[PDB]
Design a protein around this ligand. Sequence first.
Ligand SMILES: Nc1ccc(-c2cc(Cl)c(Cl)c3[nH]c4c(c23)CN(C(=O)CO)CC4)cn1
Ligand SMILES: Nc1ccc(-c2cc(Cl)c(Cl)c3[nH]c4c(c23)CN(C(=O)CO)CC4)cn1
Ligand SMILES: [Zn+2]
Ligand SMILES: [Zn+2]
Lengths: 333, 329
Amino acid sequence: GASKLRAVLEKLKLSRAAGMVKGVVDHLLLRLKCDSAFRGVGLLNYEHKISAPNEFDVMFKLEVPRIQLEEYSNTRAYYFVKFENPLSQFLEGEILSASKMLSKFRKIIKEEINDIVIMKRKPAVTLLISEKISVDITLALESKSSWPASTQEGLRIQNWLSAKVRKQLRLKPFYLVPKHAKFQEETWRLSFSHIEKEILNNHGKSKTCCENKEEKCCRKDCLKLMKYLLEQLKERFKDKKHLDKFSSYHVKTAFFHVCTQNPQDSQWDRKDLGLCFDNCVTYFLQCLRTEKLENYFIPEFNLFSSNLIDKRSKEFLTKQIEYERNNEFPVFD
Amino acid sequence: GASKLRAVLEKLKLSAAGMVKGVVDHLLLRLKCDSAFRGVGLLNEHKISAPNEFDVMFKLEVPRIQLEEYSNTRAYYFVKFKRKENPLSQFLEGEILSASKMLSKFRKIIKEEINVIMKRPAVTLLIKISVDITLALESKSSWPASTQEGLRIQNWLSAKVRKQLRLKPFYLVPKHAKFQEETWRLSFSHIEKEILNNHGKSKTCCENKEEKCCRKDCLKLMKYLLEQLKERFKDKKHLDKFSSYHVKTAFFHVCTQNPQDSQWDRKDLGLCFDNCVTYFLQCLRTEKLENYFIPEFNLFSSNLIDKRSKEFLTKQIEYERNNEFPVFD
Ligand SMILES: Nc1ccc(-c2cc(Cl)c(Cl)c3[nH]c4c(c23)CN(C(=O)CO)CC4)cn1
Ligand SMILES: Nc1ccc(-c2cc(Cl)c(Cl)c3[nH]c4c(c23)CN(C(=O)CO)CC4)cn1
Ligand SMILES: [Zn+2]
Ligand SMILES: [Zn+2]
């Protein structure tokens, strides 16, 4: 089965500015560290749409020392940030205003790019560098406290990456990105992009997974192909609105759930790529049909609930993906 | 038999920290008041047969140091500084940091807050419970060039883990180069601890019944064997220079030789321990035991331990192994 799949991954590697990204990113951080409010800003981890090699994605982190999170209305993912506080200008009463902080952030960046690069209208900010390279800059608060209680039952990697690794990972900070909920516009959602990267690049039960020939697995390739399938289908139907609400994050979440379900490295041997990918697709399909895709870190938050994505969009994606899988994925070509 | 080793391990498990933690926390609270030891803190410990004897390390970060290796001894160094903003200005003997002066002030502050004895490179306090405090400089720079070929865990714990570990800081404890009196010796106690408590090729090593290994038990038994033989022959001087660190280093080498968890199945404790002993014996006979982090530093050289001492320990261990280890009774 895997012949066309391996061809796809070969072209995908072939395709992959970063320097041009690093220049302006470090310049922006240089100026942002001059402000009293963004003094502790810094790069969180360049990152990527697998099919868009010129679309970059960076995250600026800013530690907020001693914070009081207040969960917003039983939504397990959205919070208010309550608290010499260098964010004094951004408070609106007792909660921190994402709108004000973001407006400042964008203003500093807009003034700093006009010295060199266009900033698009409201990912907090999107810069377009010379009609070819684009960079989405996201601002996130960093908290070095223990994780919120809604993550208590998430990150169930104990049988895969081990309970020891889970404890070490949960000792790391967590992040908060502004996102309006429903739309309450001063709420923040949790971010674990650092943990996701760690999980994906250190992904085997064996510490030497993918480091020698006897232990080559196909986890990363399965995730690559899943993201590519979704990106290609989103392009093919961009003029309708069906696939608009689907993102690489849904596919990455489903992939992590599959990793939990298949924790042994031998279930991911490279020679079985064909079936492994099939299984991955199938699991994603199941998540679509049952309208259930729990956040990997907050299991009570369903990314596929009918309040976030309607049934018609899910059924459309299901029909498209089933056609592709029945026809040796013509969309890849 | 193997059941004898299991009996030893069970008796060991039957075996204060609450007190040690209280005391040590008080000492650190008061030491951070002093200007020179403002950045002092705990790093992360036991003599397996002496559960009431504790070993604590007090780390102190030194932001931007220059290391000058002492006379091609790849483990001992002079600590100099880079370009009165150095809070250790009180301790320079010219341009090199003086271990003697720093240790004098260390013992002096400890001896100004305790007023439990302070027996006179550690500082020994009692509480019928004893605690040895070792002061260590912390450097967050990359590791010295002598460690480049050490920590050969690539086929065991992975090259990824080796890179991650080498990104962590390293430590320097005062120790005479036997002598010249102001040299510092490399220390990687943190890394040793981490690779001992996270020791399998599988991340889930020892977290389920299917993956119970016997690495930790093998190290425990070797340490116990050395301690019991040192007590047995304390009247002679032959075993004075052997320590649990030699045992731990040989054990780490064995883990490098045997990287697969299936080579450490708990069911084979008896053979695993045997092989451990055997490797240690080989190290004794050939007088070669490389530091696990600095391969060119030979812990078993004749300039450090004489051949007669090694031969005596060799014969005593061979006796024990040939007689089902009576020193474990
Ligand atoms: N409507 C939604 C969908 C999902 C979440 C969401 C929730 C949590 Cl708890 C985490 Cl950790 C999340 N990470 C990401 C998302 C997310 C969604 N997302 C983006 O919005 C990117 O712009 C990707 C990255 C919240 N609201
Ligand atoms: N004569 C000796 C013996 C060995 C080393 C030695 C050398 C290095 Cl590079 C490291 Cl990392 C070391 N760690 C330890 C030692 C050691 C020796 N040691 C003690 O001195 C305990 O007080 C145990 C802990 C240097 N000189
Ligand atoms: Zn792998
Ligand atoms: Zn184990």
